[PDB]
Design an enzyme around this catalytic site. Structure first.
Site, PDB file in Angstrom:
ATOM      1  N   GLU B  79       0.791  -1.217   0.000  1.00  0.00           N
ATOM      2  CA  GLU B  79       0.000   0.000   0.000  1.00  0.00           C
ATOM      3  C   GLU B  79       0.830   1.277   0.000  1.00  0.00           C
ATOM      4  O   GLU B  79       1.759   1.452   0.791  1.00  0.00           O
ATOM      5  CB  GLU B  79      -0.962  -0.022   1.190  1.00  0.00           C
ATOM      6  CG  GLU B  79      -1.789  -1.302   1.259  1.00  0.00           C
ATOM      7  CD  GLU B  79      -2.786  -1.432   0.112  1.00  0.00           C
ATOM      8  OE1 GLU B  79      -3.269  -2.560  -0.128  1.00  0.00           O
ATOM      9  OE2 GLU B  79      -3.098  -0.410  -0.537  1.00  0.00           O
ATOM     10  N   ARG B  89     -18.538  -1.363   4.262  1.00  0.00           N
ATOM     11  CA  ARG B  89     -19.763  -1.971   3.748  1.00  0.00           C
ATOM     12  C   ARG B  89     -20.222  -2.996   4.786  1.00  0.00           C
ATOM     13  O   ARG B  89     -21.354  -2.947   5.275  1.00  0.00           O
ATOM     14  CB  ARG B  89     -19.478  -2.656   2.404  1.00  0.00           C
ATOM     15  CG  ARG B  89     -20.704  -3.005   1.552  1.00  0.00           C
ATOM     16  CD  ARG B  89     -21.427  -4.273   2.008  1.00  0.00           C
ATOM     17  NE  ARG B  89     -22.411  -4.024   3.061  1.00  0.00           N
ATOM     18  CZ  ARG B  89     -23.231  -4.950   3.550  1.00  0.00           C
ATOM     19  NH1 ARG B  89     -23.186  -6.191   3.081  1.00  0.00           N
ATOM     20  NH2 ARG B  89     -24.097  -4.634   4.505  1.00  0.00           N
ATOM     21  N   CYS B 142      -8.232  -2.279   7.789  1.00  0.00           N
ATOM     22  CA  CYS B 142      -6.883  -2.316   7.267  1.00  0.00           C
ATOM     23  C   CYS B 142      -6.393  -0.899   6.990  1.00  0.00           C
ATOM     24  O   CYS B 142      -5.310  -0.523   7.431  1.00  0.00           O
ATOM     25  CB  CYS B 142      -6.826  -3.211   6.023  1.00  0.00           C
ATOM     26  SG  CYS B 142      -7.102  -4.971   6.430  1.00  0.00           S
ATOM     27  N   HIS B 166      -0.980  -6.204   1.924  1.00  0.00           N
ATOM     28  CA  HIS B 166      -2.172  -7.029   1.798  1.00  0.00           C
ATOM     29  C   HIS B 166      -1.773  -8.348   1.143  1.00  0.00           C
ATOM     30  O   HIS B 166      -1.039  -8.351   0.152  1.00  0.00           O
ATOM     31  CB  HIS B 166      -3.225  -6.324   0.942  1.00  0.00           C
ATOM     32  CG  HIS B 166      -4.239  -5.564   1.738  1.00  0.00           C
ATOM     33  ND1 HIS B 166      -4.472  -4.216   1.558  1.00  0.00           N
ATOM     34  CD2 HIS B 166      -5.103  -5.968   2.698  1.00  0.00           C
ATOM     35  CE1 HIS B 166      -5.438  -3.826   2.372  1.00  0.00           C
ATOM     36  NE2 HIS B 166      -5.838  -4.870   3.076  1.00  0.00           N
TER      37      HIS B 166
END
Lengths: 213, 213, 213, 213
Positions: B79, B89, B142, B166
């Site tokens: 990242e 969500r 995360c 990840h």
């Protein structure tokens, strides 16, 4: 009992083909009293036929498991059906791009695999190896060899068991794909070799059950 | 030199989380004269922050590498950006579905990872491990963790290096999925563990270089 | 000339099935000099066969084009082969989930579509409609109908041309998909309707060349 | 009220860019008392910044909605954040590839879009148009303009509302992609045109934030 396992040479610009390593690693091994033979096939129409036919006649295996590379596939996939047709999306290693042509004129439009695909998939799952049943092995060389193998079985009475297994790209093959756009799935070589070896075991076990009952 | 490696507990009905095994396997390890600390974080907003803060305070790592599971990803992803926002969500392991809410009010809209993401990705490829740079870590726990760690870095002066990695699903996690949709991509655990270790090694090498110029 | 076009009712939780509207919109609307009949089929094993057999006997179409919904498909796909097997990944609309079973015992393992699939694809491409040849219609009801239709053709001599077409989700169907999981591909209804009409046109054209020699 | 909508010229490899058509079709229209301006941006760094700067200076829009092509995307995506960086994976239309470089040195690491993204996504859904919020617009030209536009707003005061929308390939663009490999998702031009127009309508409706007793 003799088991025949085959893999393919590199194609489509790929530097390697994991199935070729699998054929070599399993060639000559023994599972119990059963002898396994590993042979690599060329990705060439006609030529691969002649080799497959010559190898089958030579060894006269009881079980034949053909393995091939399925770019983009995320898990091990056991082929259910072989189709009597060739419609290569890309040419073979000789530049031959055959379109809409039968493999064996007058022969059945398709053959169902004679491997215990369900039992094989079940054993793989217990081993923590992702696997599913595929209903189309494509219409390139993999479906070609699978169809021919199954045709041989129906015509010569052997191999009694025949089928096809597709494996994903192995990790090292994706390194180049990265610097060219998206990133396709892969599966470590060790898992792919184990999956194929597990298919051999399940087949051999299922055979013992058939020749007894 | 102290290195903090974090992983997460199972979330979203998942039976396991590979990042939890990774954290425990690297805990107490030493890479040269550097001491690695592996810690597992809860998949609960607020509680995760509480643990992160205390852990960073207790260890005061020089380098912090946070690892998480990214279902569907087919390769390792490093990242590059952490966004100051929370819009999930699916609810965390508590039931609270936090949507449209800053992580730290008044703080920068985003932080750039301070890990040598380019050097890391390079080493990964040399090791045959497929990896790429991700420009979005999501807006769930995360990203929450990655943001807080970097923010801590800018407010307290440590860790000097902070980032997030990840990892794809692990093979055994895919078994429970065959009737739903197309089987999700995976990467064998061993390759994921090595990938994280390599990131630590590259980050350690980059740090010894910073003190030279 | 009589042309029979079928679609299916809603299934798999969906509120609608685009192939159902297609069948209704095409029903009665002549294409050239041929009459077109649009009938909707039930996503139920057994019942769909009865409905199909009755419709073919009643109309006795010269050309039958069966349309189905293929979730996840990004373009129009023309099925090349029908397989004599049933292995539903999900149950039908009445809770029946048949596994490893033939459609017609003792009938050919598979049938090739008799539609001008390659010419249909070329025409669709000229019209700017993405389309490709699929080599597996699955083993649910869409393959079920495809097989029965092709078997009828071989058994009764009609319909002279029989095939199956899969269409992607229509936009409105993706709306509730956006929330959970990922976002599957779709294609506007107008284009799917046009694609099927095109197929009929191409079919009708090939039919003349056949009778004119 | 003056609305600015921009699109891009064909990038590289694509004979067309749907956003270029959208910009042209929307130019000149009026939504109530609001005037819509459609301008096409070059797919070249620097030149795009220049053109964007003159356009904004000339029109002084109250709302700016920039549109770009996102190959592979299966639904309309509304960009939530613009990042201050350029990491090209493919050379621009001119012939210059930029890796790790700030768009505006010293400027914020990121800017959140000032469009009613939530309101927009909701309205699209109501109209049967699949759409979702993206948390990364890449780090190429699309992100480039989005950032510059949002930076212009924060420093010059206008446009008050600025954002970016990515649209999938349109049908006709997929045709040639079919003869390569896996067919990418697409969305008919008509729906993409309406999606952008809806974003404007909602943007204007939200601008009613000047209501008092």
């Amino acid at each position: 009992m003799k088991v025949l396992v085959t893999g393919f040479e590199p194609f489509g610009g790929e530097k390697i083909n994991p199935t070729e390593r699998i054929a070599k690693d399993l060639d000559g091994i023994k599972i119990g009293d059963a002898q396994v033979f590993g042979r690599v096939l060329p990705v060439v129409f006609g030529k691969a036929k002649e080799v497959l036919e010559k190898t089958l006649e030579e060894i006269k295996p009881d079980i034949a498991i053909h393995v091939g590379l399925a770019p983009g596939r995320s898990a091990i996939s056991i082929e259910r059906i072989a189709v009597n047709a060739i419609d290569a999306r890309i040419p073979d290693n000789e530049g031959k791009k055959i379109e809409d042509e039968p493999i064996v004129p007058g022969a059945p439009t398709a053959y169902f695999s004679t491997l215990p695909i369900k039992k094989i998939m079940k054993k793989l799952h217990e081993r923590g190896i992702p696997a599913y049943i595929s209903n189309s092995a494509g219409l390139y060389l993999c479906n070609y060899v699978m169809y021919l193998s199954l045709h041989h079985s129906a015509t010569k009475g052997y191999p009694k068991m025949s089928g096809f297994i597709h494996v994903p790209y192995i990790p090292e093959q994706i390194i180049d794909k990265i610097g060219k756009g998206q990133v396709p799935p892969s599966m470590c070589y060790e898992m792919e070799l184990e999956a194929v070896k597990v298919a051999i075991e399940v087949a051999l076990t299922q055979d013992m059950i058939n020749k007894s009952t």
